[PDB]
Design a protein around this nucleic acid. Sequence first.
RNA 1: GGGAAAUUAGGUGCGCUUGGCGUUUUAGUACUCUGGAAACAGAAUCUACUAAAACAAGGCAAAAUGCCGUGUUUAUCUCGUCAACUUGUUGGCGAGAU
DNA 2: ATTTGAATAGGCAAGCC
DNA 3: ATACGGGAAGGCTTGCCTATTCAAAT
DNA 4: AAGCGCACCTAATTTCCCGTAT
Length: 986
Amino acid sequence: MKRNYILGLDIGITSVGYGIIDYETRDVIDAGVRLFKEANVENNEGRRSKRGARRLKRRRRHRIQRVKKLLFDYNLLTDHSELSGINPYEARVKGLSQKLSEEEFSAALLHLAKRRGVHNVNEVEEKYVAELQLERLKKDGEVRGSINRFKTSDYVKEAKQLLKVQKAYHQLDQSFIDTYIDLLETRRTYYEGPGEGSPFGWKDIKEWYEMLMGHCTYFPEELRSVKYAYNADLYNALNDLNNLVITRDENEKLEYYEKFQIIENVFKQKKKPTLKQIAKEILVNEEDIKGYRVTSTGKPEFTNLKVYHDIKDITARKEIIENAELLDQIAKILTIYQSSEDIQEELTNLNSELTQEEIEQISNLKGYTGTHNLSLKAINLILDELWHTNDAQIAIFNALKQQKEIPTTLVDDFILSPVVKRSFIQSIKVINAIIKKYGLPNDIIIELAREKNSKDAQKMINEMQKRNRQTNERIEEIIRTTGKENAKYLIEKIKLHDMQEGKCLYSLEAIPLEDLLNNPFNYEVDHIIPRSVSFDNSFNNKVLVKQEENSKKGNRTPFQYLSSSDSKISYETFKKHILNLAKGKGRISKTKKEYLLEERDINRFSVQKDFINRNLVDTRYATRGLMNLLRSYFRVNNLDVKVKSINGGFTSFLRRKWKFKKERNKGYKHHAEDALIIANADFIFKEWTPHQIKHIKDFKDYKYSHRVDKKPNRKLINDTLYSTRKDDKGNTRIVNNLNGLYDKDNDKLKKLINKSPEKLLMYHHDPQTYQKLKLIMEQYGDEKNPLYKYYEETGNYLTKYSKKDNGPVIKKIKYYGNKLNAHLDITDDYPNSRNKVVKLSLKPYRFDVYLDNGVYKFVKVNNLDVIKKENYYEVNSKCYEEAKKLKKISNQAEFIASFYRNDLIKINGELYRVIGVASDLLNAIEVNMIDITYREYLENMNDKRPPRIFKTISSKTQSIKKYSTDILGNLYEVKSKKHPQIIKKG
RNA sequence: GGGAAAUUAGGUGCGCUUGGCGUUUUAGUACUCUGGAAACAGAAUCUACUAAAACAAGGCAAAAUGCCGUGUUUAUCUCGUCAACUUGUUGGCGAGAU
DNA sequence: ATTTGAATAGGCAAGCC
DNA sequence: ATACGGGAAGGCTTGCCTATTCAAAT
DNA sequence: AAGCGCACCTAATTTCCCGTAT
Ligand SMILES: [Mg+2]
Ligand SMILES: [Mg+2]
Ligand SMILES: [Mg+2]
């Protein structure tokens, strides 16, 4: 309005605090907090992963259907053909010698196409798979599982033989055989991506690459150069030489002729120039030359012309090798195109003086990736200036060279880290809302978190890097000498191999380096702490293990896995080994050791409270980025606003200095009262007055603004499927399963038998096996798991009752669980299912309150109740009227409001924020407190209730009102429309 | 003190391509019961294996290496104006109130 | 004096490598 | 013509069911 | 789990550029 002020900001992961202070007096004007859900990478990773899975399953289904059509066409399959009782492993093994029936033949081909193995980068090009598979079926009693992993080439070898034999007896031609093998072996590449129509797709390779690659600095509407173009490497070569300073008679910097002869005789002759070779061309001692790039080890480093040497080595024709424009084109193609057969065509279309022999050698070159920072346009501009003048690139480009509110799109271009992007978008929206309400600030301040590096630390880091380089160089040498393909995945495995003394950490069995190199697929990089639980992809959370061991461990810690019946070794043995490995100098890091020896119960939710891990301190680039965005904005529009930043640590100092304890468990206000300190900081530092901090500390009128989510088509329901059963009383119940029966510390079954023997299905259905199990529980009652002792003492799993001791092992036990109420019924996907097939956890969209003859009532609208149309979502009318009927809501009932997640609700005069509908049936809604989480409210009190609030909406309820806050946290009793919303455009 | 480029060491993100499982139903075989000299028939749906099918609810498409569906942004209401399709409602923009 | 209904508290489970 | 205040000392997830305790009605 | 493209960030090393305040 008129009064001038300062704007403090405490930007956070979940919050943006703000503080506003009179520029003259330094009295608090206002202060508040804007709270939001942390933007976790898990969320989108989920969405992407599931999109991937959906395509894999779609493509399998479509491949099976393409095969069927081919069998219909060659009249091997009909609508009325019996494929039901035909064991395809028998039919595969039979058909490699004898005639199959049309049905057996169809069974076999369909079985192959369903499951057709891996095809991996590793390969460049005595029994069959079906022979080995039938052998295991007979010996081990089973086929499917982790050991069922074969190469597609192994499957194609079988199919070709099957079709060679069968071609005689069935009428099928080479067209059939060619078609079938294509279906079987074929798949899309990473650079093809989806089919036509995809929002995620692309037309061709160049479109694909153009979309991805970055833009030039000095010429924005131009894509960068590829890293290894001749002019790009020659550019980098000249900058090195221009930086050189020599102590000689004559000019200290190099002259044109000297640079020319150096490039021609050193950089074009020698693959890796050395200071000696440059020193000889000048005819001056090495020590005279100073000002060169240095390797971490200490060697002088000079730019290497990649393409020149690569092509020269193939063919040294001066027509080719002394033509920059061609050497830039070849480079581009080699970077952009991916497969050799694509490169060959693209070179042949280039219309050059290269021969087909030469082209075929060019197409098998490696290491062409990445981009230079400039475009060719920018390089070809300045190349003459670098040739002649000993000038810096910046100097040459320097020589030759609306809005009302801060727009939120401008962050998008440069910040890309999901968490931070969200905090910043909120922060700009918060600043805009203040500038509107209070006019322009004099100063804006932001909490920077700077981390200066100590000298001793730098030295250690340098020493560490020096040590790491040596290991990497050796690994590279091993790959160079073994003749094996240089790969970014091989280096990691080799590093882990050396770290682990060439042993699998889970089995302690040897991983021979030679075997690792020849059969890399037998060994997998495992996460110590599951990726699904943690967010750690660091080397410290990675181990090299056998494929089989990785499959068995699953989403368990080493402790959980090695304590199970599935492990080859005991946890105690493992622990001893790890501790022994830790005794060495640079064997295993402390963090890795801790992960390997993690004994806490670590699941996806339990770990949330635990494991602060690597926090988001990486906001230095961000803080710089933000203030550059803001300063730019004010500068352009001519607004006198002084944007600043202060160090993270500094705030804490003033708190200790002025005796103002950072209050955990007191509420969200801490974020705001941090902001007010930032705003005063300068004044506080000058008067090393109690009165001003009295204002900050005694201030009360804080404001909170929780963000409200109204997005349709979020997760609808939980994935898991459940069978049901009607019990003795005629109550439909979910069927559960007890797994891990033979584990040391598992008392689930022993508890269940003592409490509720009648809950087991085998109590009713296999009484003889039940009585047989009860004798075990009685025998080894004293332990946690009677079955563990049964396995330990006798060495035999519990088998179903049989007269001749030939019943199968028992591995899971089904028992009756909870009663079935709120569910989604998916039973029509299972034709002739006797019982009901269901999913659980109907996830809420909103709830709509109604006032009916003085009685408050509400409807839950499920996400399932909302359906995408052309460009809008629609709440389903039939589902909605049905829902009102179960709630007995009259046609003469007044609609009050709709409550989304975090919407504000005043129930009997008490304000809360909405979480959801605890129970539709009982009419309960879960809420939370506004200024503090209810959990923390109870902790500060030292109360031991459950930390959840539930509110019943009933004839007892007296008033329900909806409230709303602006972004700043100004609170308003809000009005509603006459009817609920049905359409949602976005 | 800010910014830039090169090399090295180490991370993060977005997008794509595959494998093997897991959950559930139906069928077959084994397991248990009954009848039968035997082949086998009926019951039971427990415990195990193999096959086929489904896997966020669903929506397009039409023989195709077919395509989409769990992310992002997102106080509320009224009035003017433009747009959309559902034709009386909701999006964008501007103004006002809570 | 005993039985039934409503409110509050205890608690399990959630797709993967 | 040259240095830019520094050494100092923070998480909640929720949908929903079952079991236990108290007050009102038969 | 296998494996590919592009982008961005941190740290270390060498060189270059620029503005404001003491
Ligand atoms: Mg802070
Ligand atoms: Mg694993
Ligand atoms: Mg904070």
